[PDB]
User: Fold this.
Amino acid sequence: ILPVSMTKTSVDCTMYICGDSTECSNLLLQYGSFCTQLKRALTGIAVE
Amino acid sequence: VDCALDPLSETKCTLKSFTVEKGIYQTSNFRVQPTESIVRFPNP
Assistant:
């Protein structure tokens, strides 16, 4: 038995962190855009 | 280049080149905007 593929998985930045929260969505980027790097690594997970 | 003019413009914006090679470029997300809003406070 060999697990060959994890489940390709991704996260939306605002939808997860803030979703409907306009204040959170606005204040997220001024505190940085970590979710972008999180996501390139996740996309790399998936594509690799 | 604008980062939200056209999808190609945003891909250039994200991969940061005007000479972008050939490939699948996930840029961002989208969730359909609320078509409507309903509010019912609890209802002598």
Q: What stands out?
A: Chain A touches chain B at residues 12-15, 43 (CB under 8 Å).
